[PDB]
Symmetry: C4
Subunit: 388 residues, 4 copies
């Protein structure tokens, strides 16, 4: 095997088709399905899999009580076959912790998990299913990372981490790994003012990450990485189609180099594909809660501070719960272009559905089509009343 190189551009996105769906909450009402959150999707050269952070309990188990909580000793990054649910019996543990990323370089997989108390967390970088490198907290305040796949180019896999406040300036670092070893790291540069939970993809030897400015911004920060020079830039999505949550209503003109104000100290992981006229943004439909999900075609969203939608697709109705969303691609597919994909975490239970004592999710995932396909909506599909 050789290292994968990002030699292709994105395919033209004219609509989205269903890729995978696990129905995990429905199925786990009467089967041994692990409680999860913070899911994602990532491909190897011969398989694509679902990933998430387990809570170390099944959803029917009594230990599901309290699973709203973000960072226990009972969490782990798990992976499982595409569109199956994350069960006790089919889930492979990648590493232990409560914040993660993972990516394949074409030869083997790197997985990273962070664990520890808030003031003393540490990352362990696994490569080829073995621990290789460890990184201690630098700011002593919830060292944390992407919660979706990283991207590699000629063996170099950049990863974005943040340590520090969620409600003020923090210390974001871009690490450049190869074979699980640190080649370099850099502090965040550019105009993004706060970074969390980056969702990344690669095309034509560039990695684009769309992140969460938890502190101030309802527009999303964007980091663009050159994995050969091992350098980066940052800015925000200029468009007035705002894509964090909660958020104010859409204005007429956005902000390219500062957070678009109105909502502080909150957010949701999300994503975009930023490719000129071939630009699509994901967002929750609700401005107030993690409800609904839609894709909007917003030509030149990155650079045009008045750009508005020219096409769209509903993924989850506003009467259904959504959650985190992120990017991935099958870098090992056939053909001349990389097909954009994404997933949406469909969160069930607390805090929105507090008649149960747990929080979990299922997954839906879509990839782009060059056709203009009809649209459906893709809810989680479980009935909370069945769990009472």
């Amino acid at each position: 095997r050789d290292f994968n190189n990002l030699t292709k551009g994105l395919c033209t996105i004219n609509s989205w088709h269903i890729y995978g769906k696990d129905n995990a909450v429905r199925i786990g009402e009467d089967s041994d399905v692990l409680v999860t959150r913070e899911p994602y999707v990532s491909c190897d050269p011969d398989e694509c899999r679902f990933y998430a952070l387990s809570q170390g309990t099944t959803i029917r188990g009594k230990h599901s009580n309290g699973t709203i909580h973000d960072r226990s000793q009972y969490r782990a990054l798990i992976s499982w076959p595409l569109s199956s649910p994350p069960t006790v019996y089919n889930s492979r543990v990648e590493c232990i912790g409560w914040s993660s990323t993972s990516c394949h370089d074409g030869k083997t997989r790197m997985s990273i998990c962070i664990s520890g108390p808030n003031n003393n967390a540490s990352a362990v970088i696994w490569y080829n299913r073995r621990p290789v490198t460890e990184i201690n907290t630098w700011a002593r305040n919830i060292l944390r990372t992407q919660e979706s796949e990283c991207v590699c180019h000629n063996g170099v896999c950049p990863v974005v981490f943040t340590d520090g406040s969620a409600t003020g300036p923090a210390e974001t670092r871009i690490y450049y790994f190869k074979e699980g070893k640190i080649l370099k790291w850099e502090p965040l540069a550019g105009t993004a003012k706060h970074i969390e939970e980056c969702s990344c993809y690669g095309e034509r030897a560039e990695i684009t990450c769309t992140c969460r400015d938890n502190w101030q911004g309802s527009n999303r920060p964007v980091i663009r990485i050159d994995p050969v020079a091992m350098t980066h830039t940052s800015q925000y999505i200029c468009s007035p189609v705002l894509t964090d949550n909660p958020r104010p209503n859409d204005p007429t003109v956005g902000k390219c180099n500062d957070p678009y104000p109105g909502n502080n100290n909150n957010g949701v992981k999300g994503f975009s594909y930023l490719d000129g006229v071939n630009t699509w943004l994901g967002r929750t439909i609700s401005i107030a809660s993690r409800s609904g999900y839609e894709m909007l075609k917003v030509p030149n969203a990155l650079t045009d501070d008045k750009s508005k939608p020219t096409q769209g697709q509903t993924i989850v109705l506003n009467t259904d719960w959504s959650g985190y969303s992120g990017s991935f691609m099958d870098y090992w597919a056939e053909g001349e272009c990389y097909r954009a994909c994404f997933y949406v975490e469909l969160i069930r239970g607390r805090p929105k559905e507090d008649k149960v004592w747990w929080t979990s999710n299922s997954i839906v995932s879509m990839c782009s089509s060059t056709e203009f396909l009809g649209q459906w909506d893709w809810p989680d599909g479980a009935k909370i009343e069945y769990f009472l």
Copy 2:
């Protein structure tokens, strides 16, 4: 691996032997078995597997209520090891949707699933476990396909689809795929007046499909495809041994080029092997309901409008529930001829057994013998009372 070519003829069918049986409803009374319907069987060069459309719930799960319904967002094409039941833990998702087909070309597998609302459905064609092509609805009325295996010849895998009314003329198309890409498609030609749910097999470079005329016919339409020329014909089975369900009583003379009347706007998926004197037709025993199943040797059924049985075999007694049936063969077996096989879906629950709130099925499957073997009957075997 090279593409498989249909170089052999059918083996002489002198009886049927048991091939597989999953006992899924019996077992799922106390294990984590998925609710399914629309099953089939399909072989790879090194394994044969069971397939079906999951309902995204176990049979004991509370989400089994409502599984009579045909087309939710919680359905998927799954496959699992031959004669095991479709469990949460052993079922592999092939694609997401509520109508499917799948076949191996000798190199790798093509799977197709259709999803969406009734007026906006779309097919995704997967090849080598990756999405490759997408097809939007052309008639905006429940785009739908075979619900059993497709057949390939030198890489060309024809698939029959229908979009449009179930109770009048519809728009049937034969697509010719290779490596998941569309080489060509054609509209239905010939004398079949309505086509659904084709059951296909190949021999000597010809693919024969026996389908369901839902609108008018109690005889079955037959499509015969030349996968090299990428052309086809259609007609009906001429025989007065009528094989849809519900149906009128058997007459003395059938119809070769039009639907045999008596029953409108209903049917069941079924199959036949049409090979001169070596012709066998499957059918439900009941003329009114999906009850019983039998194979009848009807020499020259395709072409002889007075042909009657010369031999038969009971598969399921008329006091037991049956369901869909379809053809498959192990194109990669040893020997000089292809051994005809079929499966019968044994539907349990609604609507016939409405003391439970679910609908599911198990599978029985048989292949031909050149011996004249004794016959048994093969019921599902579950006791509905245990589920109350």
Copy 3:
């Protein structure tokens, strides 16, 4: 891979060591374990596995009621990893039916299952996981076979079948298979008067089978097969150490060429290793019921009508239930000799424990040591009261 040849002799048996044990009834009290009976063990070149006839239900499932019955449509030959229990999720179906045998020839595996009603049963011979040959009943009275592994030599795998009465003369045939095809068959010859359920092993190009004379004999019939000439002989074990069950008390002098009388129309599958002074016989400890199990070293048991034990080993105490027993060896092990192995079926439930409505079993298995090892007893270990 080449076909395995029986080139080695037996290792010297000085005691028995534990080889495998599945604890299936204990575990299945609270897990998804299939109801089974008629187990055995058989090796491939790279793995050894447990085998049995499933009943198509879990032990806690409501469909376990009635599993005393021998021959339903819901039975199948399954295999699973050595010493795991036969679960819904780990059991591989080999073929469908209610009487079986299986063996590896060094290249791939042959499995045979018989199904059907009592007057119309048929065997299907699978090779390389595909059906190849079928054999119809010849006597119309419960066609039946070994219920333990067959043995192959240079691709030729003999199998013993019986069709006909269990309580009078029957029609026993030795079939010689190669690649799942029939090379030859012969009717039973020699002095054995009734044959069922042969337990076989091979050494130095000879296959020895120890069987059950259900009709008359409390000594066991022995068939010795030359798999090159494809010929055989039969006789009884001469020893007065009688090894069927139920049986009369041991006499002083046995019978070499006729059934030793006292018990009619009953028996149990069992085994022996017949190798001159290196001869060991298995038997139940009880003369009346399938209780206890012991191995007795009986030099020249086959040929010496006064031979008595010179050594022994208790396997299951007389206060614990036993059941069928049979021979197997790992023909692909390292070293200069074949190590004798056996299993004992530990039957729980009906008819002896009729407070439950099911019948199932677990497995214990042992192989020979050249050491004189200490002995333990190996009960099933489940508590029936837990199942009430």
Copy 4:
């Protein structure tokens, strides 16, 4: 594959990072998790796995009552994927018995299990998943072994066994195996006065084992083995940092060549890494019970009878239950040095938590870092009240 040679030294241990954790008791509250105890970890060239002795029952099963007991016929050595729990469906049985060790030699795995009654136990040595050698009890008093991995060098895998009293002099033997065959054995020599449950690791062609002196010592005995000469020495850890349990309080000066007194006839399996200044000792925090766990850096612990800690790391708080602990390394990792690892058995249930009727455990495991990482504590995490 070639046999692995111990060519590297230990990496510098500056802290410990999380390696694996199975959360088995939490998960098994509502899934089919086997009852276990005496766990460990061991690597193959391509995978690392968890190991333990099953009790042949699930934790929710009724047969969990009585699982405090050490030595039944229902125990087996099982292995399962790293950080998954030991389930019915994912656990591979290595051999049958109630005392074990296992190690890979670079070509394949040797596993050893001991079974039998107290006065008649026997070891079976498996190699390449087949039984090869058997060893009978020599002292007729609970033949027993390491309960963690063995270590191999150029195919020679030494294993320490003891037979005899737990409360006085016993007969300890070091066996030197190759390909599952006995090359040599030696009686214990040196100054250790009683040996049980050795925890071993290898570096620079030497194997170091830290054991349990059940009879007298609260310091731990150490055996150092030359696997080329097939010779050994023994002594105690000199340090006054005492590491058995129960134990007296730490003194100022320890004992190098005799047991440090204060506690008789009890102990716990434990471990150390003894490498000059790079020396780390594990121990329970409590002096009275199997509570808490910590690692202490004790330069020259082996040889310096006044050595005290210079650094430490808490692994399990003193308010949480611990248990056995042992060493392992991934001898097949990349890089220039072997990374020290260990596990801690987190025992739940009897005797400390006697509101339940079972005894089981989960696993936590850590490996060394050259960084000075922040520390967390890693409890089992189950709530006993949920099991009532």
